[PDB]
Coordinates of C-alpha atoms in Angstrom, one line a residue:
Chain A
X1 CA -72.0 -55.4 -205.1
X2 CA -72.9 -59.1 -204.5
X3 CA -70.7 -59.1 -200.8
X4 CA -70.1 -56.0 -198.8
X5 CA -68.5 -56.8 -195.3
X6 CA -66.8 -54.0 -192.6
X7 CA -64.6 -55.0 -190.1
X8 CA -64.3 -51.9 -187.3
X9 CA -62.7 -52.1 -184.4
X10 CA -61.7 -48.6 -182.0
X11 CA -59.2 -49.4 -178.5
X12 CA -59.6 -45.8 -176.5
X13 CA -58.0 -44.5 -173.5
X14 CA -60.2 -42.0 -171.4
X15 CA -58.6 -41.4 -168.3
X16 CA -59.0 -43.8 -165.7
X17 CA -60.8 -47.0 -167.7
X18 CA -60.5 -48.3 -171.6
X19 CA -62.9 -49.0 -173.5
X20 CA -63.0 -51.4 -176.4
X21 CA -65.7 -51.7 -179.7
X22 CA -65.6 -53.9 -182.3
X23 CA -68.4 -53.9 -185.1
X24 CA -68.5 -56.7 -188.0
X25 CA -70.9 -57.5 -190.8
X26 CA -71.3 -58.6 -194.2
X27 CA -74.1 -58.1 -196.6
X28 CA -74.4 -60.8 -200.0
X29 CA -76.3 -62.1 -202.0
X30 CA -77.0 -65.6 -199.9
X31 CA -79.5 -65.1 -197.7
X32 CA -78.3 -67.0 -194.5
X33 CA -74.8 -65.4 -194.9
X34 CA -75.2 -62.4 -193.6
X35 CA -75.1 -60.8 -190.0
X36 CA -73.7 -58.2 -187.5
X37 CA -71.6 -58.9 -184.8
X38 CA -71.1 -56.3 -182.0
X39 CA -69.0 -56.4 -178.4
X40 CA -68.5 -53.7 -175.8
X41 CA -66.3 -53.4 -172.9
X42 CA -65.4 -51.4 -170.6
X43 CA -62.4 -52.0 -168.5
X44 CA -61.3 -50.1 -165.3
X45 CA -57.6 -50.4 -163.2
X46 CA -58.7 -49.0 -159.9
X47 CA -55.6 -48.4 -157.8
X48 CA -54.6 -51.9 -159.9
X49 CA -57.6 -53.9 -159.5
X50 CA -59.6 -53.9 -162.2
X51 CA -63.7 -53.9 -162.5
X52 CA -64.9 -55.6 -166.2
X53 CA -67.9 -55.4 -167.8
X54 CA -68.4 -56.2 -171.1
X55 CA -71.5 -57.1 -173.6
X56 CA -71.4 -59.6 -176.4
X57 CA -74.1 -59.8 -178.7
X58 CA -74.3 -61.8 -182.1
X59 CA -77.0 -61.4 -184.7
X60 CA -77.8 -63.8 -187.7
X61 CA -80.6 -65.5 -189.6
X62 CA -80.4 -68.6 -187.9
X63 CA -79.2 -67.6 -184.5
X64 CA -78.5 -64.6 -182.2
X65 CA -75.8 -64.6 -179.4
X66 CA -76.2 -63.0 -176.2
X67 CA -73.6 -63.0 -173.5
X68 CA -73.1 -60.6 -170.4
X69 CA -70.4 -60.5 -168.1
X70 CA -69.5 -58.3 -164.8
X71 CA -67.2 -58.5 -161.9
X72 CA -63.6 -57.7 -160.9
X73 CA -60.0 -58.5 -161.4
X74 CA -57.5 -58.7 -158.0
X75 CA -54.4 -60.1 -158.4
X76 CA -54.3 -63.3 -160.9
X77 CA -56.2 -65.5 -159.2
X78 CA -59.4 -63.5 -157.3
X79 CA -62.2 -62.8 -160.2
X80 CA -65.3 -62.1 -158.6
X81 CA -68.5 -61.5 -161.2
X82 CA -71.1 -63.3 -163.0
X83 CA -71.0 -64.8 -166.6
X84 CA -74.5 -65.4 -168.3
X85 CA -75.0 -66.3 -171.9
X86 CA -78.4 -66.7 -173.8
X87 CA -78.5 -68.4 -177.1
X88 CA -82.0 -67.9 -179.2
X89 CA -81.8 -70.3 -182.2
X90 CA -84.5 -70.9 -184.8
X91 CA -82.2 -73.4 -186.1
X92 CA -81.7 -75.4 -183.3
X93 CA -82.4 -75.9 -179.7
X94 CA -82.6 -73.0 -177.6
X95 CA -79.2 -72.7 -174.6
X96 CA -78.5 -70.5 -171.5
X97 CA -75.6 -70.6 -169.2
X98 CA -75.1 -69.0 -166.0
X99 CA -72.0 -68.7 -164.2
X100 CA -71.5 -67.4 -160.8
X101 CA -68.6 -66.9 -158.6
X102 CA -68.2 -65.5 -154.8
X103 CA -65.0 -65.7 -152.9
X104 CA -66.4 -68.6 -150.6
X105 CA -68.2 -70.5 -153.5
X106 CA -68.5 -71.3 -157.2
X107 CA -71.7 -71.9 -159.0
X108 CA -73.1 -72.7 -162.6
X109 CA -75.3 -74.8 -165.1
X110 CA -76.6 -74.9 -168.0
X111 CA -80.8 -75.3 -169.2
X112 CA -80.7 -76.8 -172.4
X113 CA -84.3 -77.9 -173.8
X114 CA -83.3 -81.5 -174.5
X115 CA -80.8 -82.2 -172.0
X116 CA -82.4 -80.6 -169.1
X117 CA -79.9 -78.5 -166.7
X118 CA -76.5 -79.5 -165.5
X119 CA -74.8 -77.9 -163.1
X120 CA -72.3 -78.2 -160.3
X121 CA -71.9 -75.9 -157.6
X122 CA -68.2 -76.0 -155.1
X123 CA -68.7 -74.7 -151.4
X124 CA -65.0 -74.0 -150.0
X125 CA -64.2 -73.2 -146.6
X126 CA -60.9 -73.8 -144.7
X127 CA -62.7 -76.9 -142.5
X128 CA -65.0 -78.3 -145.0
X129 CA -65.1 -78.7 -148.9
X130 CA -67.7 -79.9 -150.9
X131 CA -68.1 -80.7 -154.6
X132 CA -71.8 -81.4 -156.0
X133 CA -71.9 -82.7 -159.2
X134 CA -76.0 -83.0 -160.2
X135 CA -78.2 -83.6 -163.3
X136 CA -81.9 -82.2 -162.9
X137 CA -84.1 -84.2 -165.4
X138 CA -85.8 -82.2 -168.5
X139 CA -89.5 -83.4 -167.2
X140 CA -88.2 -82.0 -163.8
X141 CA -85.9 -79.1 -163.1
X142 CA -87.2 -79.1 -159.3
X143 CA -84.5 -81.9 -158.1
X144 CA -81.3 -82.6 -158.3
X145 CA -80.3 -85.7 -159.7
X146 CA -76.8 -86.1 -158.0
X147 CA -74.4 -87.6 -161.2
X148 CA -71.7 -87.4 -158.4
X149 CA -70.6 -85.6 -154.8
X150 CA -67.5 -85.4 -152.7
X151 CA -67.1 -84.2 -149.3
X152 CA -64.3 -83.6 -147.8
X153 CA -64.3 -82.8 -144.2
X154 CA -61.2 -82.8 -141.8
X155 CA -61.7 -82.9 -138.3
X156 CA -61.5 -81.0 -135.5
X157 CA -61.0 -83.1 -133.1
X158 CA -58.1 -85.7 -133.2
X159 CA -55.8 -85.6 -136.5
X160 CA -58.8 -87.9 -138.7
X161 CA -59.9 -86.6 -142.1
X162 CA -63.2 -88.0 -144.1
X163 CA -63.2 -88.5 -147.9
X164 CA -67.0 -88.9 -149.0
X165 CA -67.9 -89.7 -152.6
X166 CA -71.1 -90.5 -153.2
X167 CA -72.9 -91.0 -156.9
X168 CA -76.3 -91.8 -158.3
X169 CA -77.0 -94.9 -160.8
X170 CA -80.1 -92.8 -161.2
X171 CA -78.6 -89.7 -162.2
X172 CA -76.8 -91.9 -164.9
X173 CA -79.3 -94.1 -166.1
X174 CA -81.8 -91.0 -166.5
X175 CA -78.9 -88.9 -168.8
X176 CA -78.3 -92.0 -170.8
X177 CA -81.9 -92.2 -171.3
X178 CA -81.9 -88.7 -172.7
X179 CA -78.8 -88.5 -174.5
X180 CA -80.5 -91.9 -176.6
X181 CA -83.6 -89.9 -177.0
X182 CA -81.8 -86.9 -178.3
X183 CA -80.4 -88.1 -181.5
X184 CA -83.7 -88.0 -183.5
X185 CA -83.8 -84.7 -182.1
X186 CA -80.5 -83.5 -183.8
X187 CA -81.2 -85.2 -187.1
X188 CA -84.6 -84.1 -187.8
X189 CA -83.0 -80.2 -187.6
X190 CA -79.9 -81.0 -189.0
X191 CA -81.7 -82.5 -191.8
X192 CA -84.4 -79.7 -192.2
X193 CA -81.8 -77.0 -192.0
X194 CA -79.8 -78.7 -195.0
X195 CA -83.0 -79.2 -196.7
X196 CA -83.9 -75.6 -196.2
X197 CA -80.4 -73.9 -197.3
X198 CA -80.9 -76.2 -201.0
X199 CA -84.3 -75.1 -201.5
X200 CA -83.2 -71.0 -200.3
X201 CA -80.5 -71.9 -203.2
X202 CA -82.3 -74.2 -205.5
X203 CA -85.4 -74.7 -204.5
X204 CA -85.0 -78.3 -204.0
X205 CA -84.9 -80.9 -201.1
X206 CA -81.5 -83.0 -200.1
X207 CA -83.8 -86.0 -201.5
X208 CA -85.0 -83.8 -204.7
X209 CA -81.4 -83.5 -205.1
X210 CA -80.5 -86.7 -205.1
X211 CA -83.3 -88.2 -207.6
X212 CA -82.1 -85.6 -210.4
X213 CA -78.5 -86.5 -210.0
X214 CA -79.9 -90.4 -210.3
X215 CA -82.4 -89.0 -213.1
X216 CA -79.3 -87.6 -215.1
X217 CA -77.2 -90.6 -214.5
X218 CA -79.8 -92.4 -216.2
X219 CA -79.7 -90.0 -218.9
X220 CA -76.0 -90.4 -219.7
X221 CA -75.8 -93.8 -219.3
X222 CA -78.7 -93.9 -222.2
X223 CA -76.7 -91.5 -223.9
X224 CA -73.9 -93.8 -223.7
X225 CA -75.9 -97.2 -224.3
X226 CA -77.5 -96.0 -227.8
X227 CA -74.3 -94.9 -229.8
X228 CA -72.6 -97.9 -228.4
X229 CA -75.6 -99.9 -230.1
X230 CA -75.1 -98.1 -233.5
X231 CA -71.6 -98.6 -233.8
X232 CA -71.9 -102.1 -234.0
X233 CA -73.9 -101.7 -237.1
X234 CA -71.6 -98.9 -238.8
X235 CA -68.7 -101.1 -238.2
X236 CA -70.2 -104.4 -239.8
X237 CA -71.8 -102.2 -242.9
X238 CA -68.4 -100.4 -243.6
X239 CA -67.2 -104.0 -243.6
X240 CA -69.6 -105.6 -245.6
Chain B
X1 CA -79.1 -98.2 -182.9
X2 CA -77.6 -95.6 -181.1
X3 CA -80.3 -95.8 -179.0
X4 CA -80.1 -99.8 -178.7
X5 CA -76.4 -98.9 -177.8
X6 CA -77.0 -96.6 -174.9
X7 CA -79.8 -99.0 -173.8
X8 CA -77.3 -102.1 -173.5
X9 CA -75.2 -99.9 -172.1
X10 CA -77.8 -99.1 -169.2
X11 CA -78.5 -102.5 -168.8
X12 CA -74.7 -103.9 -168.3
X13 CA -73.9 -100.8 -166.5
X14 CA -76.8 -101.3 -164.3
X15 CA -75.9 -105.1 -164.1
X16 CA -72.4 -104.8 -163.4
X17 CA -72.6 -102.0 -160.1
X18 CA -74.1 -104.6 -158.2
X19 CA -71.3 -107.4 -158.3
X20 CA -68.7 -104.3 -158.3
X21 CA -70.0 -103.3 -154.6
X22 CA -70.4 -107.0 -153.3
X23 CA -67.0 -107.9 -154.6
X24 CA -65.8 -104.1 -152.4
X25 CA -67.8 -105.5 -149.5
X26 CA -66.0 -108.6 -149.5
X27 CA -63.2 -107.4 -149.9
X28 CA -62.9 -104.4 -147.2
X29 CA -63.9 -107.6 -144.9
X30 CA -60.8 -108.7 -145.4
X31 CA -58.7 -106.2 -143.7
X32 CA -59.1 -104.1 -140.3
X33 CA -56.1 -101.9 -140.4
X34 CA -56.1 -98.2 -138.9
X35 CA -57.4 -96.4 -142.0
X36 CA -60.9 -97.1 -141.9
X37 CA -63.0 -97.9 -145.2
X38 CA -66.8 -98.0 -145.0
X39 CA -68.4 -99.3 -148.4
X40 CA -71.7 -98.0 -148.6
X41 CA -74.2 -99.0 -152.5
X42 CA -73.5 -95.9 -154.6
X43 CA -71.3 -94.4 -151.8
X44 CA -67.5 -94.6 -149.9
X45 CA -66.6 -93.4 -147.2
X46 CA -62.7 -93.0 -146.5
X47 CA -61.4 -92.0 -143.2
X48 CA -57.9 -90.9 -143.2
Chain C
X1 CA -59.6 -117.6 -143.0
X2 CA -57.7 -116.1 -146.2
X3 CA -58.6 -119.0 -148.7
X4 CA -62.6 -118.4 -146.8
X5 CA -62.9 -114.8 -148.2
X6 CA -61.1 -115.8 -151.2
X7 CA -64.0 -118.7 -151.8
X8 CA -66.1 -115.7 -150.8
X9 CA -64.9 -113.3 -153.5
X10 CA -65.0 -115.9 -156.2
X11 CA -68.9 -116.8 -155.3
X12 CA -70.0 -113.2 -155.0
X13 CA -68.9 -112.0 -158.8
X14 CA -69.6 -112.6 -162.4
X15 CA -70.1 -111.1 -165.4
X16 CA -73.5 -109.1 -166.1
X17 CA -75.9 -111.1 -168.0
X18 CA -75.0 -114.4 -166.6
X19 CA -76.0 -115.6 -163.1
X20 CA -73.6 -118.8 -163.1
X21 CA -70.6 -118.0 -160.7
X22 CA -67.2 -119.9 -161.6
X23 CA -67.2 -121.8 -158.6
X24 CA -69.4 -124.4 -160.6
X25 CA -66.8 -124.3 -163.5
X26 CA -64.4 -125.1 -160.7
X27 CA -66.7 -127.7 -159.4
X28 CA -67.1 -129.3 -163.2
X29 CA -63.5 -129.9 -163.4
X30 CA -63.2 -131.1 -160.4
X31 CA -65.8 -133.6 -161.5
X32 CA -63.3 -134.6 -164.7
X33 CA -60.4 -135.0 -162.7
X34 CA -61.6 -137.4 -160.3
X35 CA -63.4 -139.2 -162.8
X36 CA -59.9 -139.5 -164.7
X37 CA -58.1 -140.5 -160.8
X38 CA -61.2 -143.1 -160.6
X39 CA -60.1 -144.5 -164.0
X40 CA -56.6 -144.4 -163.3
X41 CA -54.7 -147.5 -162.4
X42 CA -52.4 -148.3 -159.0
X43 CA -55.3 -146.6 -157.1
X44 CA -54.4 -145.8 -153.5
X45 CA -56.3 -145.4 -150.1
X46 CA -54.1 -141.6 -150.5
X47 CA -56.1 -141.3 -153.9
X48 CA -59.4 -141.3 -152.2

């Protein structure tokens, strides 16, 4: 009666793709411990490639989880599809991640409210390569502050190759510069989300908690003090 | 003082780039051998 | 020309937060130790 949690899970074979489904919850009596968690994905071997999509989706009090993901399966190493996760937390700061990837290039970030975006992106072709490695700023997500870049680029002409790594002091002074500003932002909802869990239990603060344990220390060590005073005074009676 | 951490830390890291690539400079003078280094301020170049 | 870029790459670097390059160290003790060949005894034409 206080917890109630089902775990359901179903693997099923319909012809030419599987499908898979699996359900979890738990209902009790704490109010941020309870949820649904739910997943589906279809999966496909076409003549021994396979095509995947599946949908992951999380629900709870202080959070949900979305994630989506398509594309194909050739061989071991060819997985073309996109990856995008969305995170909505009241708790916390707010996330989404896309990934993306093509057979001639490779390309994801992340937009995180405090951090900003981050994101690299790989261009590969037999004659050129290039990695790009950049940090937008939070107050600007219209330009790419390059954190680092390679090039590589072997010629044509002649037998010569070019290695090009470039990086920006910029880029890194302007991350450090957020990452120090940051921390205030973790601890104010770190320390509000504790608070709020002891008063959606007690009622009380993290510092309300601490004053009554003080408060009751106080108490037993009175407790403590005033018999040891009257002993003294039973002891030296019963001797007298 | 995590944030006067990662300040210092700017500030050396800052301080320190600029003797790093003058000690390269000087250094890549040294030599003029068939592999070709080009030092470049936040950049290099390496031809092979 | 070696011991000239060496003299180079000594001038051109020091830590961050200090702007006084080792040569002057170098320079200070080289002060002491003439003072001391000064004050020695049996001095030479070859000593200065």
């Amino acid at each position: 009666p206080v917890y109630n949690a089902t775990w359901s899970a179903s693997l099923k074979n319909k012809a030419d793709y599987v499908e898979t489904v699996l359900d979890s919850t738990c209902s009790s009596t704490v109010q941020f411990l309870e949820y649904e968690l739910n997943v589906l994905g279809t999966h496909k071997i076409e003549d021994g490639t396979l095509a995947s999509k599946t949908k992951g989706t999380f629900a709870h009090r202080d959070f949900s989880a979305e994630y989506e993901e398509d594309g194909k399966y050739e061989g071991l190493q060819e997985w073309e599809g996109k990856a995008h996760l969305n995170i909505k937390s009241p708790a916390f700061t707010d996330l989404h991640l896309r990934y993306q990837k093509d057979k001639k290039g490779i390309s994801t970030s992340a937009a995180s409210p405090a951090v900003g975006t981050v994101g690299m992106d790989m261009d590969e072709d037999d004659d050129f390569s290039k990695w790009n490695f950049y940090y937008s700023p939070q107050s600007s997500p219209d330009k790419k502050l390059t954190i680092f870049k390679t090039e590589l680029r072997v010629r044509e002409s002649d037998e010569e190759t070019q290695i090009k790594v470039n990086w920006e002091e910029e880029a890194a002074s302007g991350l450090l510069t957020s990452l120090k500003d940051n921390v205030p932002k973790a601890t104010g909802v770190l320390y509000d989300y504790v608070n709020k869990y002891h008063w959606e239990h007690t009622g009380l603060t993290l510092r309300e908690v601490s004053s009554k344990l003080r408060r009751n220390l106080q108490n037993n060590a009175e407790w403590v003090y005033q018999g040891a005073i009257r002993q003294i005074d039973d002891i030296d009676v019963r001797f007298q | 003082e995590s944030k006067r951490l990662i300040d210092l830390s700017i500030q050396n890291y800052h301080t320190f780039l600029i003797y790093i690539t003058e000690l390269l400079k000087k250094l890549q003078s040294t030599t003029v051998m068939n592999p070709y280094m080009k030092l470049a301020p936040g950049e290099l170049t390496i031809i092979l | 020309k070696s011991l000239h870029m060496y003299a180079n790459r000594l001038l051109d670097h020091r830590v961050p937060q200090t702007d006084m390059t080792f040569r002057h160290v170098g320079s200070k003790l080289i002060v002491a130790m003439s003072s001391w060949l000064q004050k020695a005894s049996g001095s030479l034409p070859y000593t200065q």
